[PDB]
Structures are given as structure tokens and as C-alpha cells.
Amino acid sequence: GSQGHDTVQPNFQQDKFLGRWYSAGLASNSSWFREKKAVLYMAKTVVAPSTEGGLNLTSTFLRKNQCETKIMVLQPAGAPGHYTYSSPHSGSIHSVSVVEANYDEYALLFSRGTKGPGQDFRMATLYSRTQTLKDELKEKFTTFSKAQGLTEEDIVFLPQPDKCIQE
Numbered sequence: 001g002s003q004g005h006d007t008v009q010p011n012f013q014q015d016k017f018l019g020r021w022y023s024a025g026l027a028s029n030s031s032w033f034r035e036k037k038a039v040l041y042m043a044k045t046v047v048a049p050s051t052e053g054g055l056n057l058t059s060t061f062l063r064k065n066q067c068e069t070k071i072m073v074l075q076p077a078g079a080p081g082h083y084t085y086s087s088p089h090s091g092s093i094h095s096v097s098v099v100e101a102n103y104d105e106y107a108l109l110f111s112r113g114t115k116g117p118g119q120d121f122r123m124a125t126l127y128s129r130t131q132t133l134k135d136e137l138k139e140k141f142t143t144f145s146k147a148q149g150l151t152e153e154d155i156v157f158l159p160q161p162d163k164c165i166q167e
Helices: 032-037 135-148
Strands: 019-022 026-028 043-049 055-062 071-076 082-087 092-101 106-113 121-128
Touching: 019 121, 026 032, 106 135, 121 135
Parallel strands: none
Antiparallel strands: 019 043, 026 121, 043 055, 055 071, 071 082, 082 092, 092 106, 106 121
């Protein structure tokens, strides 16, 4: 059937099981992320098979000649394409699904949150396999964003002028 349950498209690839990714594409209704732009930090996420029977995406960012490590556990949420991770807390679970993965040089990711007091938070991510992103590739997020009824104020590409490895 149509509508009701089709916000994300199913597509499981061998690479999805494990691969290196860059924390590209950022979109938020609020201005929380913007307040973080003043610091400018980029984290590289990599999901590797864990002993728990799942994958573990570790995001590592380098900000101001400083690199930090972040470990995240992702487990299957039933049907393929949908996965969720149990964030450290008294019962906080964030559900994240991947709309579609391009076989060119980019990937579309969509994040959703409860927003503190169940304010239903909406997050959109545009990861880039390359070091950066093209306004062209940015164009895909713009057309879709404008099509949905959102301005550029909601979408922004976080810069990564540091590279924890490359230099």
C-alpha cells in the first residue's frame, strides 16, 4: 500500500554492514547545531561488526588540533533499513533510518528524536564519502528541503578543515 509507512526505502548493501563514513550534511529545525558551529568540529563515523551481533559506528572528530573518539552501538529494529541505538541514559533510544544510499559519492541519512518532552524532533543528515560536499550535491538537499517547505536556515554543511589523519 501507499502512505502510512514508507518514509524510508529498503536497501541493504554489503557496505552497509561495515564502512567508513564522514559526518556530512546537517539539518535541524532548531538552532542548537548552529551554536556549535562556533567551535567547528567534524567526526568520522565507522560502523563495524560487534560482538553483540550488530554493527558499531564510531564517530571521531578533530577540532582545533584536538581529536576525540565516540562509540555508538547500532542494533536492528526488525525490518531491514531501520536501525536504532541505545544512547547512554535511563531509557533514551533514538531511531535513525537511511532513506537511500547513492552509489556515486554521497548518502542520504534521516535522524529522528523525541525532543526532550516528546516534542518530536526531526533531523536530516547528508553524509559525504568525499572530504567535502558539492553545492551540487547540496542541491539535492536544497530541492528536497525547499520542496518540503524548509529554508536554507534549516540546512547547513559543516566544514572539516583539519583532518585527524590527512594533513
